[PDB]
Chains A and B, each alone.
With several copies, the nearest count.
Chain A
Amino acid sequence: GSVVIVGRIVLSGKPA
């Protein structure tokens, strides 16, 4: 098996 990335968190609050 392998570990999968499913989401990220940005501590700065920065938007796109």
Chain B
Amino acid sequence: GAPITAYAQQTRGLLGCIITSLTGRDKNQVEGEVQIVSTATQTFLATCINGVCWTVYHGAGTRTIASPKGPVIQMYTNVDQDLVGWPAPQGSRSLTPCTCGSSDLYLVTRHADVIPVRRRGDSRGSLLSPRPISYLKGSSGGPLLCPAGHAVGLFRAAVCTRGVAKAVDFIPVENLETTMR
């Protein structure tokens, strides 16, 4: 709802992730809308909207997702849009698309910081106060919300000029629908 506030919890260690990655069997229980996921090289974010768990292809590639019934093959894929999705895991909670069409958006980081962002285009939007690029790293696939708490898009890439981030490039909610055919 409003106001937006977030908090972060860690569930798995380093040795744990590696072993799980291979075996492809994950038995931990699930909660929340955004999940912190990780591979071997990278570690980023994935967001549940409307029964589907979505993330960035520059992170997930073509991989399956470790569930308690073994590995689970992707439902949708769209390389050209940098998007991917699986069925949302048991115990997750889904978001609902925006309708207000409001232009004041809010980015959620992997540290559970809520950053104010002002819309420009359909894929772009500007930071209200600049941050170093290192800070925004690892938060790809995190949701951007309207003030009512609804999904507007997903953080894809950042605009920087000398190691300082100025704006953000994101995947809009319409491009989910698109990809589901």
Contact = CB atoms under 8 A, between A and B. Distances in A.
A adjacent to B, CB under 8 Å: yes
Nearest to B34: A9
B5 A15 contact: yes
Interface residues of A, number: 16
A16 to B, nearest CB: 5
Contact of B35 (A8, A12, A14): A8
B119 interface: no
Contact of A9 (B12, B32, B40, B64): B32
A5 B89 contact: yes
Interface in A1-16: 1-16
Interface string B124-167: 00000000000000000000010001000000000000000000
Counting contact residues on chain B (CB < 8 A from A), the size range is 35 or more
Contact of A5 (B12, B63, B93, B95): B12
A15 B139 CA distance: 15
B10 interface: yes
Contact of A6 (B6, B11, B112): B11
B24 A2 contact: yes
A5 to B, nearest CB: 5
A11 to B, nearest CB: 5
A11 B22 contact: no
Given A1-B40, A6-B43, A16 B35 contact: no
Interface of B: 1, 4-12, 16-17, 20-22, 24, 26, 28, 30-40, 43, 45-46, 55, 60-61, 63-66, 71, 89, 91-93, 95, 108, 110, 112, 114, 145, 149
16 contacts: A2-B64, A3-B46, A3-B65, A5-B30, A5-B36, A5-B37, A6-B10, A6-B12, A6-B36, A8-B11, A8-B35, A9-B32, A9-B110, A12-B32, A12-B33, A12-B93
